[PDB]
Amino acid sequence: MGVQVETISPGDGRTFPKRGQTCVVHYTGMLEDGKKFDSSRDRNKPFKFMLGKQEVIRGWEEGVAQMSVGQRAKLTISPDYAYGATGHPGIIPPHATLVFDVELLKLE
Incomplete structure (x- = not known):
């Protein structure tokens, strides 16, 4: 599997992220059992990345591209679209399916 996108709150339904x-x-x-491993909200600072530059895992590149500006959505990402067999030891276990709660605030 790749990434499953499941809406949490609607965006404008018209403006979707494009390359660059x-x-x-x-x-x-969060891990598949629900343990949080990372959160921009706990740092109280939004996270910025450029679509297509592979600054984020593949599930983010192809999942966030499906979201409209303002949308909050749940991205469920299989390990091939994620940290894979290796994971990130001490943070992300091997072969880990990840669940992200993502809100697209704006595009710049």
């Missing part, structure tokens, strides 16, 4: 645009998001990352 900077996405401004708030996010929370």
Whole structure:
């Protein structure tokens, strides 16, 4: 599997991120059992990344591209679209399916 996108709150339904645009998001990352491992909200600062530059995992590149500006959505990302077999030891276990709560605040 790749990334499943499941809406939490609707965006404008019209403006979707394109290649080279900077996405401004708030996010929370959890393991499949629900343990949080990362969150921009706990730092109280939105996270920015440029679509297509592979600054984020593949599930983010292809999942956030499906979101409209203002939308909050749940991204469920299989390990191939994620940290894979290796994971990130001490943070992300091997072969880990990840669940992200992502809100697309604006595009820059």
